[PDB]
Amino acid sequence: EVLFQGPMEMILEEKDASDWIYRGEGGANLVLAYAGSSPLFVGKVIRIQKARRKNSNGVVSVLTSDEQHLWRENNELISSPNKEVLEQRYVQNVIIPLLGPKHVDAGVRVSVSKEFLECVDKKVTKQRPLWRVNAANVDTSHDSALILNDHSLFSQSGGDCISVEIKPKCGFLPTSRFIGKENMLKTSVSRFKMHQLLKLEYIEISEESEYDPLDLFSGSKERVLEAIKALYSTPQNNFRVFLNGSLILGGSGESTGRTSPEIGYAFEDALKGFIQSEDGHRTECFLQLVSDAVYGSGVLDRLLEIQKLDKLDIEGAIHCYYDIINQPCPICKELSLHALPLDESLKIVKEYLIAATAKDCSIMISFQSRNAWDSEPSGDYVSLKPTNQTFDYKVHFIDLSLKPLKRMESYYKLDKKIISFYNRKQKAE
Ligand SMILES: Nc1ncnc2c1ncn2[C@@H]1O[C@H](COP(=O)(O)OP(=O)(O)O)[C@@H](O)[C@H]1O
Numbered sequence: 001e002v003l004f005q006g007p008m009e010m011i012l013e014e015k016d017a018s019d020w021i022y023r024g025e026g027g028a029n030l031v032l033a034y035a036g037s038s039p040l041f042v043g044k045v046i047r048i049q050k051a052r053r054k055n056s057n058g059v060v061s062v063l064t065s066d067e068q069h070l071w072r073e074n075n076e077l078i079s080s081p082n083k084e085v086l087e088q089r090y091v092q093n094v095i096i097p098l099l100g101p102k103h104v105d106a107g108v109r110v111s112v113s114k115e116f117l118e119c120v121d122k123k124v125t126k127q128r129p130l131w132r133v134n135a136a137n138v139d140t141s142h143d144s145a146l147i148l149n150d151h152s153l154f155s156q157s158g159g160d161c162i163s164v165e166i167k168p169k170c171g172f173l174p175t176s177r178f179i180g181k182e183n184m185l186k187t188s189v190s191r192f193k194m195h196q197l198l199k200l201e202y203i204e205i206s207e208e209s210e211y212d213p214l215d216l217f218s219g220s221k222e223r224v225l226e227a228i229k230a231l232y233s234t235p236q237n238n239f240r241v242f243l244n245g246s247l248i249l250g251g252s253g254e255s256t257g258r259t260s261p262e263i264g265y266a267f268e269d270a271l272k273g274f275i276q277s278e279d280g281h282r283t284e285c286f287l288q289l290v291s292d293a294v295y296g297s298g299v300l301d302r303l304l305e306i307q308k309l310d311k312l313d314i315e316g317a318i319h320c321y322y323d324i325i326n327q328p329c330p331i332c333k334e335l336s337l338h339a340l341p342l343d344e345s346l347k348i349v350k351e352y353l354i355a356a357t358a359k360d361c362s363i364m365i366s367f368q369s370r371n372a373w374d375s376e377p378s379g380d381y382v383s384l385k386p387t388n389q390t391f392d393y394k395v396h397f398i399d400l401s402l403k404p405l406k407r408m409e410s411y412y413k414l415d416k417k418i419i420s421f422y423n424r425k426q427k428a429e
């Protein structure tokens with residue numbers, strides 16, 4: 001019998017920085033994969049908050065007063081001390097009751113020192129997209145991070161692990177009575193298709209995408225495989241494929257261009273030893289695999305129901321927003337929405353923000369080939385007949401983030417700019 005220290009929370013220090021390597025980033029977070037030898041972290045990633053270069057006391061504020069009231073239904077949620085606890089609690093107490101816990105497993109919090117976040121910042125700057133380093137770096141005045149399972153790995157070997165990420169976007173067309181007569185194309189063209197035109201105007205993509213979200217969310221196995229083939233053709237930032245955690249198709253921390261014959265030949269070859277098919281045929285087999293696992297899993301049906309919590313479109317919901325923040329409505333100048341009880345205006349706005357989490361999130365699908373000698377069977381698999389192979393798979397949601405109340409104004413101005421530009425571009429017959 002020996003004396004042990006009393007329980008204490010783990011803090012990561014300069015030593016532990018080198019055990020992580022750049023994986024990717026979006027607008028809010030940097031993500032790193034564990035390249036070390038500890039069993040705690042094998043097959044994990046860490047999610048670190050970026051800084052884009054407070055209440056009535058000078059003390060910084062986690063949620064604004066309006067946000068505390070909007071989300072007051074859960075007392076723990078609005079009591080969150082930092083953004084890491086807020087995100088755990090949002091996923092645990094808001095999202096998982098709506099999606100289920102099978103395809104969601106929130107993270108585990110961990111503390112970090114300032115030198116750790118200075119190491120990670122210097123470490124990754126070389127592998128980040130340049131316009132990302134222009135706009136944001138690691139927030140080194142923070143003291144927490146989130147640990148999560150690495151969903152590009154099937155097993156927390158003797159055979160490659162191949163996985164895909166799909167950012168599916170909004171899969172339905174609005175039916176709101178609050179969409180004005182001039183804007184009726186919003187009822188027949190998807191937001192994603194109209195948005196493409198504006199992205200081209202701003203040099204953010206090089207070609208219009210072939211992908212249509214109404215296909216992927218249709219419930220038709222023919223339409224679904226068609227969407228997967230369009231994603232492969234024009235991935236932009238909606239499709240990525242990893243081999244043992246390393247990217248082999250799509251953009252790194254950013255969107256990318258069309259799959260050229262040269263790209264396709266390289267990808268066709270990277271699939272050797274996962275798909276057992278003669279040369280020039282593995283790609284066709286792999287896209288059927290992804291399609292079958294997306295449709296067979298069923299995960300998109302419940303996701304679409306959360307998106308449809310946006311019931312009035314932003315053209316309706318924006319009026320409830322201006323009641324919430326006790327402001328004269330700039331849009332009007334309507335005694336319908338503005339005559340609602342406070343509690344109903346609040347519910348509409350809150351469900352709008354929840355819908356946005358589901359319109360903005362991603363799905364990661366990892367695969368295990370039973371060809372490998374150390375594979376283990378499960379109840380979730382796809383049988384590839386043209387290849388006489390069986391692949392087990394897992395599906396998980398990522399980026400289930402709480403949206404800030406004040407972005408409501410941004411949502412409205414982008415929408416107005418999308419539909420106006422599309423309207424103009426089509427007038428030119
Ligand atoms: N849990 C995870 N497992 C594996 N890869 C992940 C995981 N979470 C994020 N990533 C990768 O890192 C990227 C950025 O993460 P994300 O949380 O979307 O950042 P942001 O919140 O800034 O959009 C993702 O697009 C994905 O490729």
Ligand SMILES: O=c1c(O)cccc2cc(O)c(O)c(O)c12
Pocket residue numbers: 026027028237360
């Ligand atoms: O393209 C995006 C988009 O089209 C819509 C909505 C949210 C996004 C959020 C991100 O963090 C990001 O990097 C994006 O690239 C997008």
Ligand SMILES: [Mg+2]
Pocket residue numbers: 026027362399
């Ligand atoms: Mg993201």
Ligand SMILES: [Zn+2]
Pocket residue numbers: 319329330331332334338
């Ligand atoms: Zn109004």
